[PDB]
Every structure is written in C-alpha cells, then in structure tokens.
Amino acid sequence: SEEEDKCKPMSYEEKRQLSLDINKLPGEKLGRVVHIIQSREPSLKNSNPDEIEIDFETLKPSTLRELERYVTSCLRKKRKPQA
C-alpha cells in the first residue's frame, strides 16, 4: 500500500514549474488542483476555490505529483493556443 506514498518528491524546479503548469490551465481546470490539494491537505479546506491560496511548500509529495500528472494530462493534450 506504499505505492501511493512512494511517488518521488517534487523538486524545487519542479514545484515552480508545477505552480506554472497549473496556472496555465483554464480557470475550470484549476478547480481540479484546488480540489486535489484541499482534499489531500486537510489544512487548507478553509480556502474557498474562488479565492483559493495553495501553498506548494505545504503540499505532501503525493498531492504535488497528482497535481502535476493531472495538468500535464491537460497541457500535453489540447492547451497551448498561444505559443
């Protein structure tokens, strides 16, 4: 049952990019990461999604890696209409 906790920790350069990959998403899609973070991090469920403030430095590895593989799934698909 350790696979979920065995996911490697998101490094600084990854975290920074993650907060960026996440912010690349359309508003609706950041509704997912807030949902992930808020659920995985019971410490920030007071933050309302419309006024969310996520702390990438408080998130546990699994959350950060969930956030990533998620946005990565959105961004690698159809989400680059600018560049």
Binding site: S19, N23, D55
Partner: peptide, 13 residues
Amino acid sequence: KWTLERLKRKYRN
C-alpha cells in the same frame, strides 16, 4: 512564491 498573487489572480482572472 505561489500565493494569492500568482495563483488567485491567474485563477479568478
């Protein structure tokens, strides 16, 4: 880092 400034203002906007 990724507080209300970056997140919220890229989120709500």
